[PDB]
């Protein structure tokens, strides 16, 4: 319970009330491989979308709960959406975290899964952490309760405990949707406009390939890939469930820091949720010929479609087979600032 | 004598039993509103 009293006196500037929680290792293992993170709070609104300041959450892992039943990581969620009096709760209201060590993996949590279980679980001197002395005397089992998670179907333990007035006001609060409805529709909107840009670039040209990346191709390429076999190019737009892991936003976050290339690569047909948001590097002493080795290793991928984004506002789609279709990236810069505030600072 | 006022406190206990059914009763209406 070390992180509980570690960000309860630090996050009190940006947030009135702080919640203490657990994440099991089993539920967040598909967020990040090999438990590489060791956070950033950004609660987005359901009907009142906007943008909010980012709050920092101190989390430390590898340390168990008081229960021996499950052993997982520690976390905390700030609650600061409730304007003025926090007696109102916003229902169907997400809270999004950016847990990280070196930014990797994302977590989304409803306020309703949080708050329903929070009521369910119930000549100087040196300065003393009065919260630390008050935390130490509870030390019991029923402070922690297991609550199912609506995003990912697992039990997420919250630890609340009759500590002080700050949690004391918390369980007395009650009040009388569309928060994940927007982010899917937004990403599919920009994916539809990108596929329309590729449609008009294939239309103003002949229906042909320019083949930016060289790779050798067999004679049976029109057989083993059928005539107008755009099955992957059909279903590409359904396969992009994520955006903030995608390389599509990696160009927009890298405009201010200069310009490299980013790759969203997907399986020809359901071979696995492959890869999102990687780098093609010209900075290190691998150099431009080292980046060209990566790009020909990209074009030689015979079982994956590829999408390329540049940081300067251009988008490409590399077919398996070295073929490519040029395209444009440009969008209304309100959504640029929207994504830039969704990730971090403007 | 001493058996009079408990009959009055029983209706005060019934008063909260009457009024706190609305706290349940608006909640299924909220369930129908959301779902």
């Amino acid at each position: 319970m070390d992180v509980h009293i570690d960000n309860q006196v630090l996050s009190g500037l940006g947030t009135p009330l702080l919640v203490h929680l657990f994440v099991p290792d089993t539920v967040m293992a598909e967020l990040c491989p090999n438990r590489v993170p060791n956070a950033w709070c950004q609660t987005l609104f359901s009907d009142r979308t906007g943008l909010t300041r980012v709050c920092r959450v101190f989390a430390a892992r590898g340390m168990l709960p008081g229960r021996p039943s499950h052993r997982g990581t520690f976390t905390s969620v700030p609650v600061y959406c409730d304007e003025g009096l926090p007696e109102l709760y916003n229902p169907f209201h997400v809270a999004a975290l950016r847990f990280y060590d070196e930014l990797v993996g994302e977590l989304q949590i409803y306020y309703l899964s949080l708050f329903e279980g929070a009521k369910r679980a119930l000549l100087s001197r040196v300065p003393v952490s009065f919260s630390k002395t008050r935390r130490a005397i509870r030390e019991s089992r029923a402070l922690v309760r297991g609550i199912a998670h609506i995003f990912s179907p697992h039990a997420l333990y919250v630890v609340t405990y009759p500590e002080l007035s700050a949690q004391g006001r918390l369980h007395r609060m009650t009040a009388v949707l569309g928060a994940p409805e927007r982010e899917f529709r937004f990403l599919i909107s920009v994916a539809l406009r990108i596929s329309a840009s590729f449609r008009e670039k294939l239309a103003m040209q002949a229906w042909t390939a320019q083949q930016e990346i060289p790779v050798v191709i067999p004679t049976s390429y029109s057989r083993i890939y059928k005539n107008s076999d755009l099955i992957r190019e059909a279903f590409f737009t359904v396969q992009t469930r994520v955006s903030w892991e995608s390389c599509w936003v990696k160009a927009t976050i890298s405009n201010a820091p200069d310009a490299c290339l980013w790759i969203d690569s997907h399986p020809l047909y359901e071979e696995g949720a492959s890869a999102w948001g990687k780098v093609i590097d010209s900075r290190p002493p691998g150099g431009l010929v080292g980046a060209a080795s990566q790009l020909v290793a990209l074009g030689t991928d015979g079982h994956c479609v590829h999408l390329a984004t540049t940081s300067d506002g251009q988008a490409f789609l590399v077919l398996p087979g070295g073929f490519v279709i040029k395209g444009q990236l440009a969008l209304t810069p309100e959504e640029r600032g929207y994504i830039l505030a969704r990730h971090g600072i403007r | 004598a001493s058996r009079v006022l408990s009959r009055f406190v029983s209706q005060l206990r019934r008063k909260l039993e009457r009024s706190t059914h609305r706290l349940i009763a608006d909640l299924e209406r909220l369930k129908f509103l959301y779902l």
Binding site: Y110, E116, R120, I150 | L23, L27
Partner: peptide, 30 residues
């Protein structure tokens, strides 16, 4: 959205049962 609403009705349903079990306190003195 359907499986979201299914877990969403299962997380709200225990709230009204916890409220009823809180109302069952006043049962014990009546």
């Amino acid at each position: 959205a359907q499986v979201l609403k299914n877990r969403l009705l299962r997380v709200e349903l225990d709230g009204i049962m916890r409220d009823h079990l809180a109302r069952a306190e006043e049962i014990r003195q009546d």
